[PDB]
Structures are given as C-alpha cells and as structure tokens.
Amino acid sequence: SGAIYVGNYRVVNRHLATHNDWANLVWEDSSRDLLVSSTTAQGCDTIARCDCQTGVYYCSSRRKHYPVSFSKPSLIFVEASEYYPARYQSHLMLAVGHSEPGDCGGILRCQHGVVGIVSTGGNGLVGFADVRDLLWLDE
Ligand SMILES: Cc1cccc(CC(=O)N2CCC[C@H](C(N)=O)C2)c1
Ligand SMILES: [Zn+2]
C-alpha cells in the first residue's frame, strides 16, 4: 500500500484504488496502473522533474529503504494477475531489488523529489510506475 500526496491530488496504484478514489476521480490509466483522485487537504510531497536513473525506494515487506538503479520508463510485458489481463504496462521502470505484492505503493525518490511508485515485481526485481511526466500534478 501507499500513495503520493501532492497539492490537491492523491496518486495511487489503480489496482488498489478505493471506492473514495473512484468517487473523486481526476484521471486513471489501466496501461500505467495509475489513478489520481482529488483531496481536500494540501499534500506533503513534491514531484521530481528529471532523468535520474538512481534513487531510493521504500520496501514495506522489509520495513526498509533500498538504493536502486532503474531503467528509463518503457513498455514492459506484465503477466495476467487477479487485477489485469496479460498486457504491456507503459511508463514502467525496472530495477533489481526485493519486492512482494503488498509492496505496491512504496515511493521511489531521487534527490529531486518523488519519481514513482512500486507497481510490479518478483524474483528479485521491482518495477515502478513513473509519475515525472505528469506535469499537471504541480499546478
Ligand atoms: C511488487 C510486486 C512484487 C511481486 C509480485 C507483485 C504482483 C504483480 O506484479 N502484479 C499484481 C498486481 C498488479 C501488477 C500490475 N502492475 O499489473 C502485477 C508485485
Ligand atoms: Zn532526479
């Protein structure tokens, strides 16, 4: 679990969005596993606007942060799950690092701010949904 709170927006994994997220929907994209909902309170986070390929992510299944080298956002095949049919997920960045299903929502940060959230993983990989291209989150 986890979310990014920026301005009057909440960014979550689309597959973990709540009834309240859907009732306050701003934007969603199944191909990216992202959903953004509106909030009444001002957020605590800021978004990176950069091309970093290193950063640190929070891993809830270890209660720890780990450093990672990750690929640029790309279109990657993701096998069928209870949440989606087999498909290509876009804007996904892969890295070597521990992750388990409940780690989705963990934030990846670089020195410039929030880069993205854990969305996929397994077998010593961790995949992050990028948010750096969503310029409207800032205004
Ligand atoms: C973080 C992690 C580690 C091991 C396993 C998993 C599960 C996983 O990859 N799924 C299920 C949920 C939706 C995901 C998606 N973005 O399509 C795919 C997730
Ligand atoms: Zn950066």
Side-chain angles (χ1 to χ4, degrees), residues 4 13-14 18 24 26 29 33 41 47 50 57 59 63 68 72 74-75 87 90 96 99 103 110 114 137:
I4 302 165
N13 293 91
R14 189 189 186 274
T18 70
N24 290 285
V26 171
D29 185 334
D33 186 40
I47 310 303
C50 68
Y57 76 105
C59 174
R63 279 201 201 105
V68 276
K72 287 184 168 140
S74 70
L75 196 56
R87 78 210 210 283
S90 63
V96 176
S99 74
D103 287 324
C110 64
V114 173
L137 288 173

Side-chain angles (χ1 to χ4, degrees), residues 6 16 21 44 73 105:
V6 52
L16 302 176
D21 284 321
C44 59

Side-chain angles (χ1 to χ4, degrees), residues 25-130:
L25 179 64
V26 171
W27 168 82
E28 52 76 36
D29 185 334
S30 177
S31 77
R32 294 181 63 155
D33 186 40
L34 289 180
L35 181 150
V36 178
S37 62
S38 61
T39 69
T40 51
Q42 174 81 6
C44 59
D45 295 305
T46 74
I47 310 303
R49 303 296 181 193
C50 68
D51 61 359
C52 287
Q53 283 184 250
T54 66
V56 175
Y57 76 105
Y58 181 67
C59 174
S60 65
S61 65
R62 293 288 179 272
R63 279 201 201 105
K64 270 181 172 120
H65 299 258
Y66 290 112
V68 276
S69 293
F70 50 93
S71 61
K72 287 184 168 140
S74 70
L75 196 56
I76 295 175
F77 179 75
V78 177
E79 195 30 50
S81 69
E82 323 94 278
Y83 306 93
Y84 294 107
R87 78 210 210 283
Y88 290 88
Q89 178 163 320
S90 63
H91 299 264
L92 183 60
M93 299 174 296
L94 297 186
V96 176
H98 182 66
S99 74
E100 288 172 51
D103 287 324
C104 287
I107 283 172
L108 172 62
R109 279 177 166 269
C110 64
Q111 69 192 99
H112 305 107
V114 173
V115 173
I117 52 170
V118 175
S119 176
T120 72
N123 299 308
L125 291 163
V126 55
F128 308 93
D130 184 53

